[PDB]
Amino acid sequence: QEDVLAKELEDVNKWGLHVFRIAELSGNRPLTVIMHTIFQERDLLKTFKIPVDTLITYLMTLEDHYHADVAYHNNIHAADVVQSTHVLLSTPALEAVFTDLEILAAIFASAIHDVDHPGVSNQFLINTNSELALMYNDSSVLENHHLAVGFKLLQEENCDIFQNLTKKQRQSLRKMVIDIVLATDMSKHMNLLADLKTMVETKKVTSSGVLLLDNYSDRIQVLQNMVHCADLSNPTKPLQLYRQWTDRIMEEFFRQGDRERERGMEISPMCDKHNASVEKSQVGFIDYIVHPLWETWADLVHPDAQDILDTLEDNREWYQSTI
């Protein structure tokens, strides 16, 4: 079993990794084994003097704080976003662009970005007067919580994977991680995309042909959109993966709608199992959200992401053909 797991982890640099198989083969530790593999591949333990036992201890605790009973927003989703960000960071248009600390920030942010997710939306938490919405004043409720949990877990026994960073490095990493995870709130998507479009229209390339990002605003904007693309990458994956992700998020949505229905609330869009069309919802989500985002990202790194965009377009056509 460990032999098969090691074989599957050789695909960590590939779009379309067998992440559900890895989850089973690893004994439901996909986030731990994928993060460890990526940290070794990028030499991050050596670069930042991270003790291997501290890394594994933190990863296992972080993974435990994802809810195993939530159908979509669980440790498999976290592992998938981590691995997707890792591939996007390796795109030729970004070679030598980001520092090791920025790479660490993007990968760590991906790992923690949905930790302790309860399987219901920000709007549900706001409308039900939840303790989370009360704590966070209705503003990026979940995303603020994911950050607080992800950072708090570093203070548990033998969990501070950043123990050997300088103070300035820790301060910079903390700010970057907060900026990235807060950008995963879907209420920020339209303004995030509008800014990405402006960057593409005005983009500068070095004599090396890579993107020129010479200030914090531009650098953090690219990392925010990168992780947001990874979070919205399911429809760009091979169809057998995309369909499994769709089955999972549909189950999560329908469970929220069942709670809204019981409470006498208006059921959120796409959460009514007695009225939803999953196929029409996929085409609309791709047409209005996922393809506009990925087409813009593909323009930024052109032509590095052409095969990803082609897969997204093929998957849209497939779902459309089922209607």
Next chain:
Amino acid sequence: QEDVLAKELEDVNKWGLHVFRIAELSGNRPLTVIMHTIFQERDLLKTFKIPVDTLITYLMTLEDHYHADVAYHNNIHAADVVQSTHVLLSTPALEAVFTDLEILAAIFASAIHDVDHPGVSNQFLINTNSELALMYNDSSVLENHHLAVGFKLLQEENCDIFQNLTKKQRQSLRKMVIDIVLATDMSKHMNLLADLKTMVETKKVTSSGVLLLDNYSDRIQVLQNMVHCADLSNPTKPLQLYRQWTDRIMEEFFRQGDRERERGMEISPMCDKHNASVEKSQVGFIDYIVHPLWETWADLVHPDAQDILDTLEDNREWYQSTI
């Protein structure tokens, strides 16, 4: 004692209320008595069907969550900001601008705007890796906490003063209160002031001189700046009041500097009791922060803020003469 307390409360509509005397005469309940007086003066209990015992129960609970051992950010400051906002809301140039719900939001926001303040700054909380800064991801740490406490106290027994508001009224009030209290973070001062200036330059007024504010975005910006002005109203008050407020905030600042010194931290500006000039700091704070804000406010409500601005200018001249 109760008769002299009632006599001082007759000045509730006037700039320069004897708030420290009210605090003493009321047995350290200035917030409860001033809020109660303002609610009766504005007919808010009958307009919003607030039971008087519920209002008093909430107000006393809220007042109890201001720290009695914090020299400045305590219940007297909260009472002062409430009463200052109450006066600014009655500016003739703002007649007919704000709905009853907007008036309620501004007054409630003022009452809760510093609740549970620990007597140290956001930067101190961030730099000491406090629980508060961990919870709130370094962003408007105190202001998010003040809001969460103020709303959470409504859930205590017989404390829901909004129990008879319609559901849409409660959602609207909550959003406005959040927007207002978050605007009291001093890191937002410059952007807030720039937006107030833009509004002044493009302001539309009636024949008499009454402001016309058609869109919610403009009206919430005025309420944000109004409560911010009330928060920064100490230097515009009669000198005897201003000097008392200065003594209290100096004590609070120096106590923070003592904690920073004990911890071996870099001492915050104006917090080093061994290297401080409180008088020079007043002139500088007036010249760079308080006068630009109040002069812009005075222009927006031209000429209704002239007496307040006159007092600020006299106080600046006096503090300069002590140098």
